[PDB]
A paper describes a structure:
The Na+/Ca2+ exchanger (NCX), belonging to the CaCA (Ca2+/Cation antiporter) superfamily of secondary active transporters, forms one of major pathways to mediate Ca2+ fluxes across the cell membrane and significantly contributes to the regulation of Ca2+-dependent events in various cell types. The NCX is a bi-directional and reversible transporter, and utilizes the electrochemical gradient of Na+ to exchange 3 Na+ ions for 1 Ca2+ across the membrane, thus performing electrogenic transport. The f-loop consists of two tandem calcium-binding domains (CBD1 and CBD2), which exert allosteric regulation of NCX activity by binding cytosolic Ca2+. In addition to the CBD1/2, the exchanger inhibitory peptide (XIP) region located within the f-loop has also been determined to block NCX activity in response to high concentration of cytosolic sodium ion ([Na+]in).
The final selected particles were subjected to 3D refinement and yielded an EM map of 3.5-Å resolution, which includes many well-resolved features and clear densities of main-chains, side-chains. NCX1.3 structure consists of 10 transmembrane helices (TMs 1–10) and the large intracellular regulatory domains CBD1 and CBD2, with both N- and C-termini located at the extracellular side. It inserts into a juxtamembrane, highly negatively charged groove formed by TM1, β2, TM2, TM7, TM8, H1, and CBD2, and is largely stabilized by complementary electrostatic interactions. The SEA0400 molecule is allocated within a negatively charged cavity surrounded by TM2ab, TM4, TM5, and TM8. In fact, the pocket and passageway are separated by the TM2ab helix, indicating that SEA0400 inhibits transport activity through an allosteric fashion. The ethoxyaniline group of SEA0400 forms hydrogen bonding interaction with T138TM2ab and hydrophobic interactions with F248TM5. In agreement, since SEA0400 stabilizes the straight α-helical conformation and disrupts the local backbone dynamics of TM2ab, the association of SEA0400 allosterically inhibits the conformational transition.
Numbering used by the authors: 51 to 283, 405 to 501, 518 to 637, 654 to 720, 736 to 937
Write the structure that this text describes.
Amino acid sequence: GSYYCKKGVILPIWEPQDPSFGDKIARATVYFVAMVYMFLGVSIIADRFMSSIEVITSQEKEITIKKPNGETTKTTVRIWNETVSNLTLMALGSSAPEILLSVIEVCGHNFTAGDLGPSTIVGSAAFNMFIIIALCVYVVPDGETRKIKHLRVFFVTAAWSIFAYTWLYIILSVISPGVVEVWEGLLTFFFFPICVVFAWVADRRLLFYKYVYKRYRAGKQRGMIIEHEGDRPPVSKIFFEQGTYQCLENCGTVALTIIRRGGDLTNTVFVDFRTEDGTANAGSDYEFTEGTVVFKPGDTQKEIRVGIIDDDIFEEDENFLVHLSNVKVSLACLGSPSTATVTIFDDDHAGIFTFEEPVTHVSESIGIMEVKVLRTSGARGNVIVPYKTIEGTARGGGEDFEDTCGELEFQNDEIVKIITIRIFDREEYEKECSFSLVLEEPKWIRRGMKSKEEEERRIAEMGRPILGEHTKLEVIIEESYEFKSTVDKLIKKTNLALVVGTNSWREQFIEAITVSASCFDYVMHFLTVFWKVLFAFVPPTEYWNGWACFIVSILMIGLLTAFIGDLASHFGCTIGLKDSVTAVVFVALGTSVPDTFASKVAATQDQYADASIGNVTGSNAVNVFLGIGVAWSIAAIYHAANGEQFKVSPGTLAFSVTLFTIFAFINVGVLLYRRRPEIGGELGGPRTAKLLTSCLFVLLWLLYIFFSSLEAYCHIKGF
Ligand SMILES: CCOc1ccc(Oc2ccc(OCc3cc(F)ccc3F)cc2)c(N)c1
């Protein structure tokens, strides 16, 4: 015999209270078994609580599907919007126990500091932050990562979560060392509105900044669909070899080849060559050229060059003739076709302007659709092309798609330009629609200024921006792909033959026979038979559109956590174990089982890993802030109404807080893997990381509980 007892909230003190060790243990192990059994109860209840705080804070869209048989199906289906708020309204629900327990203790035990609220708060904080993270690391698929994306806000969230626990040390040890004074404790609650407004503004901030791709997945509820962030998915005749030459104006200089064939090649030949205007004009289009071409002993051909003048005047097709004469053998002669009609192509304009196609099919998922134009027959000169959006099958005006029009200038020598437009994510299953993107006449710009020589100049000027064929784009609005696939999967699986005559209060009861009418499941649920049956009676499903379970399951959590508080109070200090220890060791691992499942499924199911850690951070923040706020606010106010100090214990907690903060800094540190870019993403992919970081975190949690227990044993620690 080492410890006496304290009267509970519901349960009374065990009658003899001090038998031999033959009974100082049996009642203790009975207590422990009843406690783990109530922990299973609380697990199932908080499961239902989360699954009914998710029906509220969610939108339902109506979907109709035309069956090929000749009829259709019209049914509304919820789509849980996964904002940042919808993770701080389920990091809270999932942490409903560790708050209410704290509320009961101080009320139950005569408005005095019952040291099983802070101990369980810190114990569950360390347990989650060191073990749920290990699971989020080593429960992902065999090899793959879901590395965090919004690392920009994790710093703030984690620095808040760790400012929370080192604030307990602040309230009761540094401003007043042993008192939760009246003014403090009030802000411990008011700091929760800080978090809620932070969520309620930093969701909108990152909502419109991101039209990012919203992947869809199947919630484990009846018909919930969860949206989240993802990525997007024998005479030597001499003559021209060719009597006609083709070349472009931009070349300037062009080459002509003149071949001697047959006869005696050893004779040096001198042949006069000279150019003459055909349709060409010297000094404006090309330069007149003349001279002598010399063939060495043994040559077969020679090359000459003539200059061609290029300008910004888009002239018509044009040519001029080069002629040869005066063949001298110093057997050989001037070959036939000794004149080359060099013909030229002018390209000094822009010309044809046409769209890609007149019709395209684009899903609403893109949101910002980016389609191009195309130029043909040159690009010189500047243009100003109007682009108009005209409504179609659906009604535009920035309702189904952002309908705006206007004008875009195409700079000189720019072949390709791409115009954008914005598109709504109406967030609904539909079919195709249509809209139009007609083009009209651009405005031409040449040189900034805007007898036959001038008339031919205008005959050249005719080259201007003329529209091509494709001048109006009727885009087709399509259906989001993943959304279609997910709703198809769900309809093929569930949500069939539904009407509210009797949905659950008659059918939440069938689980007994529905599950026990292979051999593993038997013993897997002969401990939950009672719990499930007792949990189908009182929290009936969402008849009140979400609030038909959240107004009851909270009361049942109150009942079960009253049982937990009383039994943990009467088990600790019965075997002799200090009351605080069994929080950090025993109660914490059972009050926070829902969190583990929530984070685990979030990690293994989505594509990122910020919700799975957002859960941990939100739970750690709300536990401490809300729990101590309400419990110690009411305690301090009660002692204020008649003038007392509320002398909470400074010690027995400070060491745990400081140790947790040190270990939490180590956590946040090693979270960013050493050499991370080739030690994989956040969760998985590297065998060594995935398989040893988890063991490190488990060792850290083990050291935490071990040293909390040691400090409670001997207390000789430096604090
Ligand atoms: C000053 C208060 O700081 C706070 C500290 C902790 C808090 O708890 C949570 C922390 C992170 C959460 O997820 C973040 C998230 C971001 C994202 F881009 C996409 C999905 C996400 F899940 C949810 C809850 C809150 N809400 C505020």
